[PDB]
Amino acid sequence: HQCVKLNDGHFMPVLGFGTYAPPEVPRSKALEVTKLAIEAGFRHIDSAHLYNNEEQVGLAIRSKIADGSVKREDIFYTSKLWSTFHRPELVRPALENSLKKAQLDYVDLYLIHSPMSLKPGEELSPTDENGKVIFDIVDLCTTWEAMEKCKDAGLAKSIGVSNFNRRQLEMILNKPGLKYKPVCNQVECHPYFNRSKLLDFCKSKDIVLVAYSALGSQRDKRWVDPNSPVLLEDPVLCALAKKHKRTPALIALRYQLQRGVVVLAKSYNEQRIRQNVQVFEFQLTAEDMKAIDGLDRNLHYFNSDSFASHPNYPYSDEY
Numbered sequence: 001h002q003c004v005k006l007n008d009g010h011f012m013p014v015l016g017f018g019t020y021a022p023p024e025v026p027r028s029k030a031l032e033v034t035k036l037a038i039e040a041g042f043r044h045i046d047s048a049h050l051y052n053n054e055e056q057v058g059l060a061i062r063s064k065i066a067d068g069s070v071k072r073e074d075i076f077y078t079s080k081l082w083s084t085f086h087r088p089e090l091v092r093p094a095l096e097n098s099l100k101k102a103q104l105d106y107v108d109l110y111l112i113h114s115p116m117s118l119k120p121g122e123e124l125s126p127t128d129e130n131g132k133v134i135f136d137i138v139d140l141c142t143t144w145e146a147m148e149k150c151k152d153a154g155l156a157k158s159i160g161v162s163n164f165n166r167r168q169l170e171m172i173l174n175k176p177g178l179k180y181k182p183v184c185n186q187v188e189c190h191p192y193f194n195r196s197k198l199l200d201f202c203k204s205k206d207i208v209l210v211a212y213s214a215l216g217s218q219r220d221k222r223w224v225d226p227n228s229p230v231l232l233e234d235p236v237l238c239a240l241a242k243k244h245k246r247t248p249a250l251i252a253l254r255y256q257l258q259r260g261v262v263v264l265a266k267s268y269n270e271q272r273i274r275q276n277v278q279v280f281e282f283q284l285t286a287e288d289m290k291a292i293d294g295l296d297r298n299l300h301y302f303n304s305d306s307f308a309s310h311p312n313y314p315y316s317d318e319y
């Protein structure tokens with residue numbers, strides 16, 4: 001039920017539903033599970049142009065409004081601007097396209113999906129002759145100004161960023177004539193990779209940190225190494241789950257809630273969808289919090305070696 005106030009006065013529910021599924025999953029599933037999520041109690045829904053599901057997610061939202069379960073104001077819907085659309089003149093069209101797809105008049109939140117700009121076009125992964133992804137050089141402050149214009153039109157209630165580091169955050173925050181600060185920064189965050197200092201910074205700036213892969217990634221072999229430790233098989237998370245008679249997933253979500261993190265959870269399983277909302281029914285102890293704090297290993301699940309040579313590549317390599 002609980003929300004946090006954003007720095008523009010709008011409110012964001014602290015538990016959000018992740019809608020991404022791989023291309024093999026039929027598009028119909030995004031409709032079904034998003035309705036299940038709303039029925040379960042989720043009020044924050046996370047989607048993106050990249051996810052090729054905005055039609056289905058939007059239709060689930062419209063369906064739960066039209067059947068009386070919720071009103072539009074109950075739902076917090078997020079879309080994201082894809083990296084081929086960073087040039088300013090492309091920002092508002094991209095948003096409008098997402099809205100046309102989702103059959104919504106506005107999103108509650110529009111994010112720059114990633115700082116790593118790609119060659120402009122309606123090709124989402126532009127590639128050269130060698131199969132290498134073509135980059136683009138774009139001043140993300142011009143992107144941000146186009147985002148601000150989207151907010152002023154009422155097309156996006158709030159605007160923010162995703163996958164930005166300290167420096168890209170400040171470059172937005174330092175922008176001349178800046179009208180709206182980013183309400184949030186959505187990044188990978190879980191007990192293996194807690195982002196404690198990025199988190200402190202955001203709290204300092206009245207920016208909400210939003211955790212994705214908070215259950216440990218869906219572990220797509222295309223982008224995730226299967227040797228990596230499975231987050232939900234962690235001995236300490238499992239121990240705490242037995243202690244509280246909850247599940248490792250529930251422990252991992254509560255961990256973020258108690259450290260002031262808004263947290264996403266993807267599930268396309270009806271039972272797990274309904275289990276994840278129980279995160280509001282219990283508390284971890286300060287000692288449990290410490291034991292989970294101790295799990296931090298700066299572990300990135302997503303491997304983006306292909307993107308390491310990008311000027312805005314967000315996690316600087318050990319190089």
Ligand SMILES: NC(=O)c1ccc[n+]([C@@H]2O[C@H](COP(=O)([O-])OP(=O)(O)OC[C@H]3O[C@@H](n4cnc5c(N)ncnc54)[C@H](OP(=O)(O)O)[C@@H]3O)[C@@H](O)[C@H]2O)c1
Pocket residue numbers: 017018019020021046047113162163186187211212213214215216217218232247249250264265266267268269272273275276
């Ligand atoms: N900004 C970005 O670049 C970015 C990147 C990645 C993701 N995201 C967003 O964040 C969302 C969540 O991240 P994610 O897709 O990596 O997955 P996640 O939330 O880390 O969940 C990973 C897996 O955990 C399983 N799971 C869910 N609830 C569970 C429970 N109670 N017990 C045990 N297992 C459970 C799910 O499988 P089942 O479906 O089988 O339950 C899911 O595949 C995405 O869907 C997307 O909305 C954003």
